[PDB]
Design a protein around this nucleic acid. Sequence first.
DNA 1: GCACCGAAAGGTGCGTATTGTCTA
Length: 280
Amino acid sequence: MLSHMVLTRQDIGRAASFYASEWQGKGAEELGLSGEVDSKRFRELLAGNIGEGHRIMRSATRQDSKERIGLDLTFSAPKSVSLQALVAGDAEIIKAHDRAVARTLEQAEARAQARQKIQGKTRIETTGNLVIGKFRHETSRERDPQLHTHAVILNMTKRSDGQWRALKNDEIVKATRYLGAVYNAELAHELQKLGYQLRYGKDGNFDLAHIDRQQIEGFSKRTEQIAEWYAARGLDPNSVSLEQKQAAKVLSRAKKTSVDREALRAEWQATAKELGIDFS
DNA sequence: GCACCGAAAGGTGCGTATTGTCTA
């Protein structure tokens, strides 16, 4: 699954709480960023402080509009993949997901764009470079195992004239469904190299063949919450407005509390026994 | 493209778009 969200200045706490960490992007390399994401630097870049002999970015933002700190792309593995990675414990599966993300983001980077204005005349440019902070996470809001990576694309890109400007995001934002398919294709290919058999689900989605739908359902509490929020509002899961799909996804939430990580995984393992899961 | 940003006859958000496993 690939979902996206435009991150605004009011998200500067939450977007820094993303901080298991990796920089990616030709933009990042050119700034000398590679390896683990230093959080102070991440906060600086969120604020548009690219530093190293450059003016603070984005000052031409209207006060009536919100300023944009970035674009969050969230890659989420199928549940059976999450199970094998996080319950059984498999670094190869984690690695396979990391590769799928990195290769998809290369295709996101290819689509990075900017504007330039030459004497009242605006042209759109394909810059092909991004600065991206990747943060891998492991649980859902209902504390189910859930392998997922937040790829925070910072709102910046280097134009042809070598100048740092805000990202025009259209080409990435309108290709979410395509990049989603790249992630699946890459993950599936990587999982097949590791010897796994796959089961296909109408969309390009798949799961590991040795884990069945009932076993998936046992570990998908957030899905049960969404499915119920439609059944109560009388709404049908086939056709619903973007205002409604966002409603069910945000309203149906309950609240949670600082989970004992070592104790959580033991719960997962026991649940997986109850469900009868053979991690082979 | 527009209309308001800082003050460059330049640059920005705006809206875009989002399948399931349900993020941000």
